[PDB]
Coordinates of C-alpha atoms in Angstrom, one line a residue:
Chain E
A940 CA -0.2 0.1 0.0
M941 CA 2.3 2.6 1.2
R942 CA 5.1 0.6 2.6
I943 CA 5.6 -0.7 -0.8
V944 CA 6.6 2.7 -2.1
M945 CA 10.0 3.6 -0.8
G946 CA 12.4 2.3 -3.6
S947 CA 9.9 2.2 -6.5
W948 CA 9.6 5.6 -7.6
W949 CA 13.3 6.0 -6.6
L950 CA 14.2 3.4 -9.5
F951 CA 11.8 5.6 -11.4
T952 CA 14.9 8.0 -11.7
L953 CA 17.7 6.3 -10.6
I954 CA 17.9 3.8 -13.5
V955 CA 17.1 6.6 -15.7
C956 CA 20.3 8.3 -14.5
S957 CA 21.9 5.1 -15.1
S958 CA 20.7 5.0 -18.7
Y959 CA 22.1 8.4 -19.4
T960 CA 25.3 7.4 -17.6
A961 CA 26.0 4.4 -19.8
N962 CA 24.5 6.3 -22.9
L963 CA 27.3 8.7 -23.3
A964 CA 30.2 6.3 -22.8
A965 CA 31.2 6.3 -26.7
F966 CA 29.6 9.1 -28.4
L967 CA 33.0 10.4 -29.6
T968 CA 33.9 7.4 -31.5
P969 CA 54.1 0.0 -39.2
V970 CA 50.5 0.6 -39.3
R971 CA 49.0 2.5 -36.3
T972 CA 46.7 5.1 -38.1
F973 CA 46.0 6.6 -41.5
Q974 CA 46.8 10.2 -41.8
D975 CA 50.4 11.6 -41.7
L976 CA 49.6 14.5 -39.3
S977 CA 47.6 12.2 -36.8
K978 CA 51.0 10.6 -36.8
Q979 CA 52.6 13.8 -35.5
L980 CA 51.4 13.5 -32.0
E981 CA 52.3 9.7 -31.9
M982 CA 55.6 7.8 -31.2
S983 CA 58.8 8.8 -32.8
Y984 CA 60.4 8.1 -36.0
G985 CA 63.0 5.7 -37.5
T986 CA 64.6 7.6 -40.3
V987 CA 68.5 7.0 -41.3
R988 CA 70.4 9.7 -39.0
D989 CA 72.8 12.1 -40.3
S990 CA 71.3 11.9 -43.7
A991 CA 70.1 14.4 -46.2
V992 CA 66.6 13.8 -44.7
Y993 CA 68.2 14.4 -41.4
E994 CA 69.8 17.5 -42.7
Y995 CA 67.4 19.3 -44.8
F996 CA 64.6 18.7 -42.6
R997 CA 66.6 20.4 -39.7
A998 CA 67.1 23.0 -42.4
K999 CA 63.4 23.4 -43.0
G1000 CA 61.3 21.9 -40.3
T1001 CA 63.0 24.7 -38.2
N1002 CA 61.8 26.9 -41.3
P1003 CA 58.5 28.2 -39.8
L1004 CA 57.4 30.0 -42.9
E1005 CA 58.0 26.7 -44.8
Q1006 CA 56.6 24.6 -41.8
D1007 CA 53.4 22.7 -42.6
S1008 CA 52.6 21.3 -39.4
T1009 CA 54.3 17.9 -39.5
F1010 CA 58.2 19.0 -40.0
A1011 CA 58.7 20.4 -36.8
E1012 CA 56.5 17.8 -35.0
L1013 CA 58.6 15.5 -37.1
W1014 CA 61.9 17.3 -35.8
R1015 CA 60.8 17.2 -32.0
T1016 CA 60.1 13.6 -32.4
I1017 CA 63.5 12.5 -34.0
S1018 CA 65.8 14.6 -32.0
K1019 CA 65.2 12.8 -28.7
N1020 CA 68.4 13.1 -26.3
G1021 CA 70.4 14.0 -29.5
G1022 CA 68.9 11.5 -31.4
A1023 CA 69.3 8.6 -29.2
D1024 CA 67.5 5.5 -30.2
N1025 CA 67.3 7.0 -33.6
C1026 CA 70.8 5.6 -33.8
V1027 CA 72.5 5.0 -37.4
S1028 CA 76.2 4.0 -37.8
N1029 CA 75.8 2.1 -40.6
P1030 CA 72.7 2.7 -42.7
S1031 CA 70.8 -0.4 -42.2
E1032 CA 70.8 0.0 -38.4
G1033 CA 67.8 2.4 -38.4
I1034 CA 66.6 0.5 -41.4
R1035 CA 66.3 -2.3 -39.1
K1036 CA 65.6 -1.3 -35.7
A1037 CA 61.8 -0.6 -34.5
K1038 CA 59.9 -3.2 -36.4
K1039 CA 58.8 -4.2 -32.8
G1040 CA 60.3 -1.1 -31.5
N1041 CA 57.3 0.5 -32.9
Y1042 CA 58.6 3.8 -34.5
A1043 CA 57.9 4.4 -38.1
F1044 CA 59.5 6.4 -41.1
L1045 CA 59.8 5.2 -44.5
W1046 CA 61.7 5.8 -47.8
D1047 CA 60.1 6.7 -51.0
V1048 CA 57.4 4.3 -51.5
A1049 CA 59.3 2.5 -54.4
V1050 CA 62.0 1.0 -52.1
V1051 CA 59.4 0.7 -49.2
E1052 CA 57.4 -1.6 -51.0
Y1053 CA 60.4 -3.2 -52.8
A1054 CA 61.3 -4.3 -49.3
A1055 CA 58.0 -4.5 -47.4
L1056 CA 56.1 -6.5 -49.9
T1057 CA 58.9 -8.9 -50.2
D1058 CA 58.2 -9.6 -46.3
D1059 CA 55.8 -11.8 -44.7
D1060 CA 54.2 -9.2 -42.1
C1061 CA 52.2 -6.6 -44.0
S1062 CA 51.4 -4.7 -40.7
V1063 CA 54.8 -2.8 -41.5
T1064 CA 52.7 -0.8 -43.6
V1065 CA 53.4 2.7 -43.0
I1066 CA 51.4 5.2 -45.0
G1067 CA 53.4 7.5 -47.6
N1068 CA 55.2 10.9 -47.2
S1069 CA 57.9 12.0 -49.5
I1070 CA 59.7 15.3 -50.1
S1071 CA 57.5 17.1 -52.9
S1072 CA 60.9 19.0 -54.0
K1073 CA 63.9 17.0 -53.2
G1074 CA 64.5 13.5 -54.7
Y1075 CA 66.8 11.6 -57.0
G1076 CA 67.9 13.2 -60.4
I1077 CA 70.2 12.5 -63.1
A1078 CA 74.0 13.5 -63.0
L1079 CA 76.3 14.8 -65.6
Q1080 CA 79.1 17.5 -65.6
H1081 CA 79.1 20.7 -67.3
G1082 CA 80.2 21.1 -70.9
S1083 CA 79.5 18.0 -72.2
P1084 CA 77.3 18.5 -75.3
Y1085 CA 74.7 15.7 -74.4
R1086 CA 72.1 17.0 -72.2
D1087 CA 69.3 17.8 -74.9
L1088 CA 70.1 14.5 -76.4
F1089 CA 69.2 12.7 -73.1
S1090 CA 66.7 14.8 -71.8
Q1091 CA 65.0 14.0 -74.8
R1092 CA 64.8 10.4 -74.0
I1093 CA 63.9 11.5 -70.2
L1094 CA 60.8 13.2 -71.1
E1095 CA 59.8 10.9 -73.8
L1096 CA 59.5 7.7 -71.5
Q1097 CA 56.8 9.5 -69.8
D1098 CA 55.3 10.9 -72.9
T1099 CA 54.9 7.5 -73.9
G1100 CA 54.4 6.4 -70.4
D1101 CA 56.8 3.5 -70.5
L1102 CA 58.6 5.1 -67.8
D1103 CA 55.5 3.7 -65.9
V1104 CA 56.0 0.4 -67.9
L1105 CA 59.7 0.1 -67.1
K1106 CA 58.7 1.1 -63.2
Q1107 CA 56.1 -1.6 -63.5
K1108 CA 58.4 -4.0 -64.7
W1109 CA 60.7 -5.0 -62.1
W1110 CA 58.4 -3.1 -59.5
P1111 CA 54.6 -3.9 -59.8
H1112 CA 52.4 -2.1 -57.7
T1113 CA 50.1 -5.0 -57.1
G1114 CA 52.1 -7.5 -55.2
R1115 CA 51.0 -10.1 -52.5
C1116 CA 49.6 -7.3 -50.4
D1117 CA 47.3 -5.4 -52.6
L1118 CA 47.0 -2.3 -50.2
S1119 CA 31.0 -2.2 -33.0
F1120 CA 28.8 -4.8 -34.6
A1121 CA 29.0 -8.1 -32.8
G1122 CA 28.5 -7.5 -29.0
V1123 CA 25.3 -9.3 -28.6
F1124 CA 26.6 -12.7 -29.7
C1125 CA 29.1 -12.1 -27.4
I1126 CA 26.7 -13.0 -24.5
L1127 CA 23.9 -14.3 -26.7
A1128 CA 24.1 -18.2 -26.3
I1129 CA 25.3 -17.6 -22.8
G1130 CA 21.4 -17.3 -22.2
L1131 CA 20.9 -20.6 -24.3
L1132 CA 23.4 -22.0 -21.7
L1133 CA 21.7 -20.5 -18.9
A1134 CA 18.2 -22.1 -20.2
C1135 CA 20.1 -25.4 -20.3
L1136 CA 21.2 -24.8 -16.6
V1137 CA 17.6 -23.9 -15.3
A1138 CA 15.2 -25.8 -17.5
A1139 CA 17.3 -29.3 -17.6
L1140 CA 17.8 -29.0 -13.8
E1141 CA 14.2 -28.5 -13.4
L1142 CA 13.3 -31.7 -15.5
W1143 CA 16.0 -33.7 -13.9
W1144 CA 15.0 -32.9 -10.2
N1145 CA 11.4 -33.6 -11.1
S1146 CA 12.8 -36.7 -12.4
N1147 CA 14.6 -37.4 -9.1
Chain O
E669 CA 59.3 18.9 -79.8
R670 CA 60.1 21.9 -77.8
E671 CA 63.0 19.7 -77.0
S672 CA 63.7 18.7 -80.6
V673 CA 65.8 21.7 -81.8
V674 CA 65.0 24.2 -79.0
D675 CA 65.3 24.0 -75.1
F676 CA 63.7 24.5 -71.6
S677 CA 65.2 25.6 -68.2
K678 CA 64.6 23.6 -65.4
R679 CA 61.5 23.1 -63.4
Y680 CA 59.5 26.0 -61.9
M681 CA 56.6 23.7 -61.1
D682 CA 55.2 20.3 -61.6
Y683 CA 52.5 18.5 -63.3
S684 CA 48.8 18.8 -62.3
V685 CA 45.7 19.4 -63.4
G686 CA 42.5 20.8 -61.5
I687 CA 38.8 20.1 -61.1
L688 CA 36.2 22.7 -60.8
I689 CA 33.0 21.8 -58.9
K690 CA 31.0 24.7 -57.8
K691 CA 28.8 24.4 -54.5
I692 CA 17.2 10.2 -48.5
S693 CA 16.6 12.2 -45.3
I694 CA 15.6 10.4 -42.5
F695 CA 17.0 7.0 -43.7
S696 CA 20.7 7.9 -43.2
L697 CA 20.9 7.2 -39.6
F698 CA 20.0 3.4 -40.0
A699 CA 22.6 3.4 -42.6
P700 CA 25.6 3.4 -39.9
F701 CA 24.3 -0.2 -38.7
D702 CA 24.8 -3.4 -40.2
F703 CA 21.4 -4.1 -41.6
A704 CA 21.5 -8.0 -41.1
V705 CA 21.1 -7.8 -37.1
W706 CA 17.6 -6.6 -37.5
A707 CA 16.6 -10.0 -38.7
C708 CA 19.2 -11.6 -36.3
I709 CA 16.5 -10.1 -33.8
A710 CA 13.8 -11.2 -35.9
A711 CA 14.8 -14.8 -35.8
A712 CA 15.6 -14.8 -32.1
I713 CA 12.0 -14.6 -31.2
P714 CA 11.1 -18.0 -32.6
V715 CA 14.0 -19.1 -30.4
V716 CA 12.2 -17.5 -27.3
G717 CA 9.0 -19.0 -28.8
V718 CA 10.3 -22.4 -28.4
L719 CA 10.1 -21.9 -24.8
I720 CA 6.4 -22.2 -24.5
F721 CA 7.3 -25.9 -24.1
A722 CA 10.6 -20.8 -15.4
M723 CA 9.5 -18.0 -17.3
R724 CA 11.1 -15.3 -15.4
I725 CA 14.4 -16.8 -16.8
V726 CA 13.1 -15.8 -20.1
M727 CA 11.9 -12.5 -19.2
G728 CA 15.3 -11.8 -17.3
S729 CA 17.0 -12.8 -20.6
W730 CA 15.0 -10.0 -22.3
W731 CA 15.4 -7.4 -19.8
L732 CA 19.1 -7.5 -20.1
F733 CA 18.9 -8.4 -23.8
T734 CA 17.2 -5.4 -25.5
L735 CA 18.5 -3.2 -23.3
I736 CA 21.6 -2.8 -25.4
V737 CA 19.4 -2.6 -28.6
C738 CA 18.0 0.6 -27.2
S739 CA 21.1 1.8 -26.6
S740 CA 22.1 0.6 -30.1
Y741 CA 19.5 2.8 -31.5
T742 CA 20.6 5.7 -29.1
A743 CA 24.1 5.2 -30.6
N744 CA 23.9 6.3 -33.9
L745 CA 22.7 9.8 -33.4
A746 CA 26.0 10.9 -33.1
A747 CA 26.8 11.0 -36.7
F748 CA 28.8 14.0 -37.0
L749 CA 30.9 13.9 -33.5
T750 CA 34.2 12.2 -33.6
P751 CA 28.7 20.7 -53.4
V752 CA 30.8 17.5 -53.0
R753 CA 30.4 14.0 -51.2
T754 CA 33.0 11.8 -53.2
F755 CA 36.6 12.8 -54.3
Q756 CA 37.9 10.3 -56.7
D757 CA 38.6 11.0 -60.3
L758 CA 36.9 7.6 -61.1
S759 CA 34.4 8.0 -58.5
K760 CA 32.5 10.9 -60.1
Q761 CA 32.7 9.1 -63.7
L762 CA 29.3 7.7 -62.8
Chain U
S1486 CA 35.9 31.9 -69.5
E1487 CA 33.1 29.7 -71.1
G1488 CA 33.9 27.2 -68.4
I1489 CA 33.5 29.5 -65.7
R1490 CA 29.9 29.8 -65.7
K1491 CA 29.2 26.3 -67.6
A1492 CA 30.8 24.8 -64.5
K1493 CA 28.8 27.3 -62.6
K1494 CA 25.6 26.4 -64.5
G1495 CA 25.8 22.8 -65.5
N1496 CA 27.3 19.8 -64.0
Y1497 CA 30.6 20.0 -65.5
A1498 CA 33.6 19.6 -63.5
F1499 CA 36.7 21.0 -65.4
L1500 CA 40.0 20.0 -66.8
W1501 CA 42.4 23.0 -66.0
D1502 CA 45.2 24.5 -63.8
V1503 CA 44.7 24.4 -60.4
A1504 CA 46.1 27.8 -59.8
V1505 CA 43.7 29.6 -61.6
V1506 CA 40.9 27.9 -59.9
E1507 CA 42.5 28.9 -56.7
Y1508 CA 42.6 32.4 -57.8
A1509 CA 38.9 32.2 -58.8
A1510 CA 38.3 31.0 -55.3
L1511 CA 40.2 34.0 -54.1
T1512 CA 38.0 36.3 -56.0
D1513 CA 34.5 35.0 -55.6
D1514 CA 32.5 37.0 -52.8
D1515 CA 30.9 33.7 -51.7
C1516 CA 32.8 30.4 -50.9
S1517 CA 31.0 28.4 -53.5
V1518 CA 33.0 25.9 -55.3
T1519 CA 34.9 22.7 -54.7
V1520 CA 38.7 21.3 -55.9
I1521 CA 40.4 18.1 -55.7
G1522 CA 44.1 17.8 -55.2
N1523 CA 46.6 16.5 -57.7
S1524 CA 50.2 15.2 -57.3
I1525 CA 52.5 14.4 -60.2
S1526 CA 55.9 15.5 -59.6
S1527 CA 58.0 13.3 -61.9
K1528 CA 57.0 15.7 -64.9
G1529 CA 57.6 19.5 -64.4
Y1530 CA 57.4 22.6 -66.0
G1531 CA 60.6 24.5 -67.0
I1532 CA 60.9 27.8 -69.0
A1533 CA 61.9 27.9 -72.6
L1534 CA 65.3 29.8 -73.8
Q1535 CA 67.2 30.5 -76.7
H1536 CA 68.8 27.3 -78.0
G1537 CA 72.6 28.1 -77.1
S1538 CA 72.7 30.4 -74.2
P1539 CA 76.0 30.6 -72.0
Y1540 CA 74.1 31.0 -68.6
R1541 CA 71.5 28.1 -69.1
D1542 CA 72.7 26.1 -66.3
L1543 CA 73.3 29.4 -64.1
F1544 CA 69.9 30.3 -64.9
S1545 CA 68.8 26.9 -63.6
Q1546 CA 71.0 27.3 -60.6
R1547 CA 68.9 30.0 -59.4
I1548 CA 66.0 28.0 -60.5
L1549 CA 67.2 25.1 -58.2
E1550 CA 68.1 27.1 -55.3
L1551 CA 65.2 29.6 -54.9
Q1552 CA 63.3 26.3 -54.6
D1553 CA 66.0 24.8 -52.2
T1554 CA 65.4 27.8 -50.1
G1555 CA 61.7 27.5 -50.9
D1556 CA 61.6 31.4 -51.6
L1557 CA 60.0 30.2 -55.0
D1558 CA 57.2 29.0 -52.8
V1559 CA 57.0 32.0 -51.0
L1560 CA 56.5 33.6 -54.3
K1561 CA 53.8 31.2 -55.0
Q1562 CA 52.4 32.3 -51.5
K1563 CA 52.4 35.8 -52.6
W1564 CA 49.6 36.0 -55.2
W1565 CA 47.9 33.0 -53.8
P1566 CA 48.3 32.0 -50.1
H1567 CA 47.1 28.7 -48.5
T1568 CA 44.0 30.0 -46.9
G1569 CA 42.3 32.3 -49.6
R1570 CA 39.0 33.9 -49.7
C1571 CA 37.0 30.4 -49.9
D1572 CA 38.1 28.0 -47.3
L1573 CA 36.4 25.1 -49.0
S1574 CA 14.0 16.3 -41.1
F1575 CA 10.7 18.1 -40.7
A1576 CA 9.6 16.6 -43.8
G1577 CA 10.2 13.1 -43.1
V1578 CA 6.5 12.3 -42.5
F1579 CA 5.4 10.0 -45.5
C1580 CA 8.5 7.5 -45.3
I1581 CA 7.5 5.3 -42.4
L1582 CA 4.3 6.3 -42.5
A1583 CA 3.7 4.3 -45.7
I1584 CA 5.2 1.2 -44.9
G1585 CA 2.3 -0.1 -42.7
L1586 CA -0.3 1.1 -45.1
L1587 CA 0.2 -2.2 -46.9
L1588 CA -1.0 -4.0 -43.8
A1589 CA -3.6 -1.3 -43.0
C1590 CA -5.2 -2.1 -46.2
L1591 CA -4.8 -5.9 -45.6
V1592 CA -6.6 -6.0 -42.7
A1593 CA -10.1 -5.2 -44.0
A1594 CA -9.2 -7.9 -47.0
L1595 CA -8.9 -10.8 -44.5
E1596 CA -11.8 -9.5 -42.4
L1597 CA -14.1 -9.4 -45.3
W1598 CA -12.5 -12.9 -46.7
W1599 CA -13.4 -14.7 -43.5
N1600 CA -16.4 -12.9 -42.1
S1601 CA -18.0 -13.8 -45.7
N1602 CA -16.7 -17.3 -44.9
Chain W
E573 CA 76.4 22.3 -54.5
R574 CA 76.8 19.5 -57.0
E575 CA 74.7 21.0 -59.7
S576 CA 76.7 24.3 -59.4
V577 CA 80.0 22.5 -60.3
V578 CA 78.7 19.6 -62.4
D579 CA 75.6 19.6 -64.5
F580 CA 72.5 17.6 -63.9
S581 CA 69.4 16.3 -65.9
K582 CA 65.8 16.1 -64.6
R583 CA 64.3 14.6 -61.8
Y584 CA 62.1 11.5 -61.8
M585 CA 60.9 10.8 -58.2
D586 CA 61.0 12.2 -54.7
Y587 CA 62.6 10.7 -51.5
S588 CA 62.8 10.0 -47.6
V589 CA 64.5 7.4 -46.0
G590 CA 63.2 4.8 -43.2
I591 CA 62.6 1.5 -41.5
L592 CA 62.7 -1.8 -43.8
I593 CA 63.7 -4.9 -41.9
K594 CA 61.1 -7.8 -41.1
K595 CA 63.2 -8.4 -37.7
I596 CA 35.6 -5.8 -29.0
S597 CA 32.2 -4.7 -30.1
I598 CA 30.2 -3.1 -26.9
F599 CA 32.9 -2.8 -24.1
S600 CA 33.4 0.9 -24.8
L601 CA 30.5 1.2 -22.2
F602 CA 32.8 0.1 -19.7
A603 CA 36.0 2.4 -20.2
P604 CA 34.0 5.4 -18.1
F605 CA 32.3 3.0 -16.0
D606 CA 33.0 1.0 -12.8
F607 CA 32.0 -2.6 -13.6
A608 CA 30.8 -3.3 -9.9
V609 CA 27.5 -1.4 -10.0
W610 CA 25.9 -4.5 -11.8
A611 CA 26.5 -6.3 -8.6
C612 CA 25.1 -3.2 -6.5
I613 CA 21.9 -3.7 -8.4
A614 CA 22.2 -7.4 -8.0
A615 CA 22.8 -7.0 -4.2
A616 CA 20.4 -4.1 -4.1
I617 CA 17.7 -6.8 -4.9
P618 CA 17.0 -8.8 -1.7
Chain H
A378 CA -8.2 -9.7 -31.6
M379 CA -6.3 -7.3 -33.6
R380 CA -4.6 -5.5 -30.5
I381 CA -1.2 -7.4 -32.1
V382 CA -1.8 -6.3 -35.5
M383 CA -1.4 -2.4 -35.9
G384 CA 0.1 -1.7 -32.5
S385 CA 3.7 -1.5 -33.9
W386 CA 3.3 2.3 -34.9
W387 CA 2.9 3.7 -31.2
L388 CA 6.2 1.6 -30.3
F389 CA 8.6 2.2 -32.9
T390 CA 8.3 5.6 -34.7
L391 CA 7.5 7.4 -31.3
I392 CA 11.0 6.3 -30.3
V393 CA 12.0 7.5 -33.9
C394 CA 10.3 10.8 -32.7
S395 CA 12.2 10.8 -29.2
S396 CA 15.5 10.3 -31.3
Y397 CA 14.6 13.6 -33.3
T398 CA 13.7 15.3 -30.1
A399 CA 17.1 14.2 -28.8
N400 CA 19.5 14.8 -31.5
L401 CA 18.6 18.3 -32.4
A402 CA 19.2 19.3 -28.8
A403 CA 22.8 17.7 -28.4
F404 CA 23.6 19.4 -31.8
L405 CA 23.1 22.9 -30.3
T406 CA 26.6 22.8 -29.2
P407 CA 24.7 42.2 -26.9
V408 CA 28.0 40.0 -27.2
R409 CA 28.3 36.7 -29.1
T410 CA 31.8 36.2 -29.1
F411 CA 35.0 38.2 -28.0
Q412 CA 36.9 37.7 -31.3
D413 CA 38.0 39.4 -34.3
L414 CA 37.7 36.2 -35.9
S415 CA 34.4 34.5 -34.8
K416 CA 32.5 37.6 -35.9
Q417 CA 33.9 37.5 -39.4
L418 CA 30.4 35.7 -40.5
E419 CA 28.5 38.9 -39.3
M420 CA 27.9 41.4 -42.1
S421 CA 27.0 45.0 -42.8
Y422 CA 30.5 45.9 -41.3
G423 CA 30.5 49.7 -40.4
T424 CA 33.8 51.3 -40.6
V425 CA 35.5 54.8 -41.4
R426 CA 37.6 55.6 -44.3
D427 CA 40.8 57.9 -44.6
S428 CA 41.9 56.8 -41.2
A429 CA 44.9 55.3 -39.6
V430 CA 43.1 52.1 -38.9
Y431 CA 41.7 52.3 -42.5
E432 CA 45.4 52.8 -43.8
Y433 CA 47.6 50.7 -41.5
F434 CA 45.5 47.5 -41.4
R435 CA 45.0 47.4 -45.2
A436 CA 48.8 47.1 -44.8
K437 CA 48.3 44.5 -42.5
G438 CA 45.4 42.9 -43.9
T439 CA 48.0 42.3 -46.9
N440 CA 51.5 41.1 -46.9
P441 CA 50.6 37.0 -46.7
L442 CA 53.8 36.2 -44.7
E443 CA 51.7 37.6 -41.8
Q444 CA 50.2 34.4 -40.6
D445 CA 47.5 35.8 -38.6
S446 CA 44.8 35.6 -41.4
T447 CA 42.3 37.1 -39.1
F448 CA 43.4 40.5 -40.1
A449 CA 43.5 39.5 -44.0
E450 CA 40.0 38.4 -43.3
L451 CA 38.9 41.6 -41.6
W452 CA 40.6 43.0 -44.5
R453 CA 38.6 41.5 -47.3
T454 CA 35.6 41.8 -45.2
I455 CA 35.4 45.4 -46.3
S456 CA 37.9 45.5 -48.9
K457 CA 35.0 44.7 -51.6
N458 CA 32.8 47.3 -53.2
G459 CA 36.4 49.2 -53.7
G460 CA 36.8 49.3 -50.1
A461 CA 33.5 51.0 -49.8
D462 CA 31.3 47.8 -48.8
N463 CA 29.1 49.0 -46.0
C464 CA 31.2 52.0 -44.9
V465 CA 30.9 55.5 -43.2
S466 CA 33.4 58.5 -43.8
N467 CA 34.0 59.5 -40.3
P468 CA 32.9 58.3 -36.7
Chain T
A1 CA -10.6 10.3 -15.3
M2 CA -9.3 10.8 -18.7
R3 CA -8.3 14.5 -18.6
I4 CA -5.6 15.0 -16.1
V5 CA -4.4 11.7 -17.6
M6 CA -3.3 14.3 -20.3
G7 CA -1.2 15.8 -17.9
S8 CA 0.5 12.5 -16.5
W9 CA 1.9 11.0 -20.0
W10 CA 3.0 14.6 -21.0
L11 CA 5.2 15.0 -17.9
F12 CA 6.1 11.3 -18.9
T13 CA 7.3 12.6 -22.3
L14 CA 8.3 16.2 -21.4
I15 CA 10.6 15.7 -18.3
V16 CA 12.6 12.8 -20.0
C17 CA 13.2 14.7 -23.1
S18 CA 14.0 17.7 -20.7
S19 CA 16.5 15.3 -19.0
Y20 CA 18.7 15.1 -22.3
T21 CA 20.9 17.6 -22.9
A22 CA 22.4 18.0 -19.5
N23 CA 24.3 14.9 -20.0
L24 CA 26.2 17.0 -22.5
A25 CA 26.9 19.4 -19.8
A26 CA 28.6 16.4 -18.1
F27 CA 29.9 15.2 -21.2
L28 CA 31.5 18.2 -23.4
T29 CA 33.2 20.5 -21.1
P30 CA 44.9 20.6 -17.1
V31 CA 43.1 23.8 -16.9
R32 CA 39.5 25.0 -16.3
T33 CA 39.3 28.5 -15.2
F34 CA 41.6 31.4 -16.6
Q35 CA 41.3 34.7 -14.4
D36 CA 44.0 36.1 -12.4
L37 CA 41.4 36.7 -9.7
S38 CA 39.8 33.3 -9.9
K39 CA 43.1 31.6 -9.0
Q40 CA 44.0 33.7 -6.3
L41 CA 41.5 31.5 -3.9

């Protein structure tokens, strides 16, 4: 009557509080992520130290007018304790190191997937970032009257696109590696087991 | 053929081309969810309907069970909380 | 110039320099266009000259080094900076309302079918 | 510095240098939640 | 009886109504802001010609090495109509 | 009665929908306060 009242309409609001409570819990929701600027707040980077990447990024990541939000974050990650754990004495040292050390930096993606797609891991897939103004060119010396002869053949291979054909010859882009919804069933047939716990024990206990 | 008898100097810029674009209403919040599990619930009620042949174990299944399904429909309200729609050259061919 | 308004008036995505579209975004009084990036750096754009000139490598050395200093890109950022001028329901009644009217019509069908039986 | 003294030809690619040697569904409700309150219900029962 | 037949409607879409009742209230988040940048979206922006603030900050809403684009945005707020967008001559 | 029942389910609608956005007050908004005078205390 009136003795039955106390915890009842208490539960008419406390469980509602609890419903709103458990409601909000997820509403803001090498390979680790997918975007290069999202890498800029993560663990540090395994480049080859004392490289031109190591040189010219210190020259231009410290250039603030020529800073584009990664290169200083690059620099503060790689410069740890004067470059400690980014250690390179021989070149393959930093090339080896942080597979399971879980740092990440890459080459131009050609020599990347030259080594990475000749691996059995494919969790070594770090996303692409390369210097849009610096790379590898073609070297001669001043005074040999040969350049327009040869830069003819330079431009023509991509005019044909056979520059792409010869890249794809010894380096196909395909390779062996081409590149929230199940929580009911986590506990679903547990109820079918509790059904077997209850009703079969009822049946055998009646059979006893 | 601007190289065949004449010359360029070296690169001021690099190759590109630009693309100028200028700048379903209530269906779209069921779309973040996998539509199969709707019928996974719809076949579960025949399994509960077996239990005609206590009952408070079956009730106490369900008061725990669709709890999360109600929270699941409460979940997809957050659809922006973490003209053009598609950005591929091939995706806009269609 | 035809591709200005024909892309404005008519679903035409265009084939052109991005930098022209960048300044056309820099000129429109409303932020009302969309561009998609492009990255092909194996092919470049140089500057022609007289075939036979003493300072061609010396020209290209400044072409090189002003990009190596990146002040060439500061010259890009003069006339077109990175930000620019353009920074790039209650009518849902019938939809769920109509799905059950199949059944709402079918109720009287099975009523009159069995009530005549 | 090279291209001042010995002439080059055009680029073909870009560059970096890095590392290359081989050598749940629903439980996000509990990352803010202290799990014992289920038992606080189950012992608030009797 | 047909209590079973049509009764799905006051269950389901009433919840869908409660959802539309909900989600728009969450998406909600004199003076509006205290910024010279957050109020760039407010138009009909009165300002004085032939003044020092008319002069020097046109020199500072230009020069794209100046990496505070608030100033260039407030510049181009009034720079249209030849600088006479919605403008007064004197205070 | 059928008429103050109107006042019942409406409060069962209103107050729960009114209970709604205060979760974002708990949810959305290290440092919290920025005044020189507010940190004197």
